Design an enzyme around this catalytic site. Structure first.
Site, PDB file in Angstrom:
ATOM      1  N   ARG A   1      -4.345  -4.245 -23.638  1.00  0.00           N
ATOM      2  CA  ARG A   1      -3.771  -3.861 -22.240  1.00  0.00           C
ATOM      3  C   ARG A   1      -3.346  -2.292 -22.431  1.00  0.00           C
ATOM      4  NH1 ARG A   1      -0.405  -9.265 -20.424  1.00  0.00           N
ATOM      5  NH2 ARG A   1      -2.271 -10.409 -19.195  1.00  0.00           N
TER       6      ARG A   1
ATOM      7  N   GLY B   1       5.715  -9.490 -18.595  1.00  0.00           N
ATOM      8  CA  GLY B   1       4.394 -10.246 -18.656  1.00  0.00           C
ATOM      9  C   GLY B   1       3.365  -9.427 -19.102  1.00  0.00           C
TER      10      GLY B   1
ATOM     11  N   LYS C   1       4.714  -6.921 -23.721  1.00  0.00           N
ATOM     12  CA  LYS C   1       5.241  -5.916 -24.697  1.00  0.00           C
ATOM     13  C   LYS C   1       5.473  -6.703 -26.091  1.00  0.00           C
ATOM     14  CE  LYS C   1       8.685  -5.889 -21.692  1.00  0.00           C
ATOM     15  NZ  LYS C   1       7.910  -5.794 -20.473  1.00  0.00           N
TER      16      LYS C   1
ATOM     17  N   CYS D   1      -0.760   1.986   1.942  1.00  0.00           N
ATOM     18  CA  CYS D   1      -1.070   1.171   0.889  1.00  0.00           C
ATOM     19  C   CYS D   1       0.231   0.621   0.230  1.00  0.00           C
ATOM     20  CB  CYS D   1      -1.934   1.872   0.062  1.00  0.00           C
ATOM     21  SG  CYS D   1      -2.504   0.878  -1.523  1.00  0.00           S
TER      22      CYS D   1
ATOM     23  N   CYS E   1      -6.335   0.904  -4.778  1.00  0.00           N
ATOM     24  CA  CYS E   1      -6.139  -0.387  -4.224  1.00  0.00           C
ATOM     25  C   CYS E   1      -7.290  -1.482  -4.063  1.00  0.00           C
ATOM     26  CB  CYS E   1      -5.035  -0.477  -2.969  1.00  0.00           C
ATOM     27  SG  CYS E   1      -4.587  -2.078  -2.576  1.00  0.00           S
TER      28      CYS E   1
ATOM     29  N   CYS F   1      -4.451  -1.916   3.634  1.00  0.00           N
ATOM     30  CA  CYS F   1      -5.661  -1.202   3.072  1.00  0.00           C
ATOM     31  C   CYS F   1      -6.892  -2.177   3.902  1.00  0.00           C
ATOM     32  CB  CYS F   1      -5.995  -1.300   1.561  1.00  0.00           C
ATOM     33  SG  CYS F   1      -4.902  -0.113   0.600  1.00  0.00           S
TER      34      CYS F   1
HETATM   35 ZN   LIG Z   1      -3.616  -0.940  -0.635  1.00  0.00          ZN
END
Ligand SMILES: [Zn+2]
Ligand SMILES: [Zn+2]
Lengths: 527, 527
Positions: free
Chosen positions: B31, B54, B57, B391, B406, B413
């Site tokens: 990640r 989550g 780490k 947004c 987004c 949006c």
């Molecule tokens: Zn958005």
DNA sequence: GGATCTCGACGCTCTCC
DNA sequence: GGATCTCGACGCTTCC
């Protein structure tokens, strides 16, 4: 014999008829029973025709008038109805005349001459029933004309006015029996939309007729869409729903909104005017100047919508009315049919939308209290509004007792839904527990007070322990109560007060069926 | 240098790293910032990682432990957080161990041996900060282990507890500065989600660190749908709205409902239980037998929904949470993100739905009264709820102050609507006329009392002549008032009472801007 | 103390052609 | 007389 034997273009005058229709009237074909009725009258026999308003009754004696020497005499109660016809006949080039109370001396003189004038081309003469009863002179001219064989036919428009059941009775219609007594070789045609078997049987007596044919045309107007929607509790939301129709599907098109009262009409008009709509109001109290102003602008499409009481009806023939909305339900199916039938007189698709509101029952019930079967007629209308499965046309035909083919032209035929019988007995038991308590308390419940108590609202004295309303929306409770009413498990009880008639509910006559603990009340609901 | 210079698989360990990722951790790729952080730590340099909960780490120090000689030391405040990890490592076949208050004599004995045992394959040891400050024995073993080169790495979880700004502060975290003082050649990694520059600036001092890298992971969870709906006034209607979602779009799927209070949680649970939903309640007062009962069954998908206060949160890692619903708004944007961020930890599409209700402001406002910047945080949350154009992701990034993509994954949006600036100034002037009058009457107005007066309802003394509310729905008026509050044209006023803190509204600091008669207040609305 | 409830209370408007 | 309106009456109802 029946109508079918007369649906035939076999007769010595079938040529002369198909021809007059096609070229003098500029019509192409006959509507149902039109061919049959003309044949009977041409055959010189007596016939009663029952046919919806706007169905084309007028053709059926105007055309014969033209296939004969001289004139057909036409009896008609209102001067406006007569003027309606003559405009149409003048425009078609047909020589027709009528006589009035306010008729010119020059005109009466000329008419009298024409009737016995063997050379008269005047083919239809319209008169009021007063003329038959209170004119010796006219009767004598008729007698001479009958003797000169120039007078072969009698038309009586609105024959239902003869009877004391006929909700448009006129005393002068009782004198008209003299016609077949004096002129037995003049054939007679009676026309009406509003005909009960016992009203016809009476008109047949008053007019001194037997034997007689009775032909009944079907109610159906195939281009009409019939829908019943729930009426909103909020009056501004109800307005908002309407403007969206007029400005959506009905943009630019002409239509009518029917209201319960004159106040309803004035309020709703203003309401729509403020929101952009070209709307106009029509009720009886209106200055007749304003009665006319509104028809003119509407017929000319300057106004898009007339917002009116039942007082707007007599002599409406505008052809391109694309929608009729009922803001409140009518008093009766007969009024509804008649009120909504003013739509789509051009035979193109048109919409007929009735907004059903619980409260309206009682405003109307209270109002028609003085009518014998006022309530009975109202309750029949409510049962229409309550129906969610049956084809709307199927329901109407049950009222006319007609041999009932909708083709998805009503809301219930378009539904894909299924249905079932929901048992609502306990709600009734529960409501009767409430009413029983109320009289033991000497308390009168308006329909509002009952619903509140059921819901566990209203005055706490009026509530009954262990009675819980279901978490159904209010409109569902309204429908459940309306159901028990018309089923007469509940009944209305009216109270007359200084200014108003108000309705209260009580245990009705059928509540004793619930003495059977196995008794079941069911209501059809969507599956 | 920046993270980018470290997003590289160029290093002498990279081959070993990729291999351990895929074949030990069974993970396929890294990640964001996961690669960069490991590289820094493997290079034996100091790094702080700021990354959503989550986000992964833990990987960033567990994996190095395995790519190094000896063990990595992990400092962790809660026993549950440690046990959380150890279950997972046990499941992976990794030798990891921890020490505790309630730790066995046999277990303590064995650990000390492993630490200095040169042949040990034990690669991770978890301990509490209490162990560092109040155990002479353990520090000596660490010293021995550090000298035997078996101790090369330090992990401090929840590093934010160090600071007098970090809202989970722990006194014992102040002693931890001894570690880099005694073990300067052991590299240190600090992990947290909740990191302000002045909390980081403080932890770096406490821990006796400089220099240091700081890597901040983006908040973004691309699979999450963010929506704000209006909360209904009727609580039974609100329940009904929810059940249609759960039995509609979320049929069979797992989710969470977050509530303001424990009573809210118990009520809504019961409410849903009665309607068929397998719903369970979780708040702090619950007997921990039931706190546990609820988690087991939910994780095992026996319960579909946990109905909870913020007490349900610490150590939640369920991957297939498909929806998080906020029954009431959170205290802060930071709480919302974290609370809603528990959805869709499998990275597949998930829904995040907040019900915004006017009344909730004040229920929340009153409670965090004792918090310094509680209100300010709430108002930031309110300002999020009030936005109809921007947004949702854009608004959040402004809060973390991150360089904000987004793709229609928020309600705003997805809108096709346009917007405009409505001038609502006169409404403010009107409400200020009411409040001025109220104080001139020594009357305190709750927000409820204000709206009623504005609406021309409530006690007649509290109303102002010539003030007409607009015919907008109540929820729109609620929004206009909410607008002036956070803008501080209005302000809250708390009253402390026997049992409760209640909120009243008053003229706020910014009302003096309206002394300008040209002053303009505008609010964005749909066109 | 705020807020829903309940009680007499005073305020309006009182059905088509 | 039926709804609406307006009033003081007593009784009940803050997270990790
Ligand atoms: Zn958005
Ligand atoms: Zn049909």
């Amino acid at each position: 014999s029946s109508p079918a034997a007369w649906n035939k273009e076999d007769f010595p005058w079938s040529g002369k008829v198909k021809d007059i229709l096609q070229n003098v009237f500029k019509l192409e074909k006959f509507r149902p029973l039109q061919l049959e009725t003309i044949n009977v009258t041409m055959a010189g026999k007596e016939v009663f025709l029952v046919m919806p308003t706007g169905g084309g009754k007028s053709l059926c004696y105007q055309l014969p008038a033209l296939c004969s020497d001289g004139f057909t005499l036409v009896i008609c109660p209102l001067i406006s109805l007569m003027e309606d016809q003559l405009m149409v006949l003048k425009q078609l080039g047909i020589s027709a005349t009528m006589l009035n109370a306010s008729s010119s001396k020059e005109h009466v003189k000329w008419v009298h001459a024409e009737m016995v004038n063997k050379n008269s081309e005047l083919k239809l003469i319209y008169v009021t029933p007063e003329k038959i009863a209170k004119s010796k002179m006219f009767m004598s001219r008729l007698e001479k004309a009958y003797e000169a064989r120039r007078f072969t036919r009698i038309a009586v428009d609105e024959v239902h006015c003869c009877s004391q059941w006929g909700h448009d009775f006129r005393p002068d219609y009782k004198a008209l029996g003299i016609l077949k007594r004096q002129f037995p070789n003049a054939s007679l045609i009676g026309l009406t939309a509003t005909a009960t078997n016992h009203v016809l049987t009476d008109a047949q007596k008053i007019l001194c007729i037997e034997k007689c044919f009775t032909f009944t045309a079907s109610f159906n107007r195939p281009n009409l869409y019939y829908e019943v929607r729930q009426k909103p509790s909020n009056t501004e939301d109800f307005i908002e729903d309407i403007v969206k129709l007029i400005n959506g599907r009905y943009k630019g098109q002409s239509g009518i909104i029917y209201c319960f009262s004159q106040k309803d009409s004035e309020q709703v008009t203003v309401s729509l005017q403020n929101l952009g709509i070209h709307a106009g109001a029509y009720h009886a109290n209106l200055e007749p100047e304003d009665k006319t102003t509104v028809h003119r602008k509407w017929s000319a499409n300057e106004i898009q919508v007339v917002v009116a009481t039942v007082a707007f009806g007599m002599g409406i023939d505008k052809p391109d009315v694309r929608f009729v909305i009922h803001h409140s339900m009518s008093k009766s199916m007969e009024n509804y049919y008649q009120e909504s039938g003013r739509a789509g007189r051009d035979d193109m698709k048109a919409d007929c939308i009735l907004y059903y509101g619980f409260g309206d029952i009682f405003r109307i019930s209270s109002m028609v209290v003085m009518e014998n079967v006022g309530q009975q007629k109202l309750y029949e209308m409510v049962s229409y509004c309550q129906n969610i499965s049956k084809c709307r046309r199927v329901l109407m035909a049950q009222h006319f007792d007609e041999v009932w083919a909708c083709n998805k032209m009503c809301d219930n035929c378009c539904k894909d839904s299924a249905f079932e019988r929901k048992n609502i007995t306990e709600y009734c038991r529960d409501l009767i527990k409430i009413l029983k308590q109320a009289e033991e308390l000497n308390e009168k419940l308006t329909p509002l007070k009952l619903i509140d108590s059921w819901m566990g609202k209203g005055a706490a004295k009026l509530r009954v322990a262990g009675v819980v309303a279901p978490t159904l929306p209010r409109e569902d409770l309204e429908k459940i109560i309306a159901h028990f009413l018309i089923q007469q498990y509940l009944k209305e009880d009216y109270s007359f007060t200084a200014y108003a008639t108000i309705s209260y509910l009580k245990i009705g006559p059928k509540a004793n069926l619930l003495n059977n603990e196995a008794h079941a009340i069911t209501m059809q609901v969507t599956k």
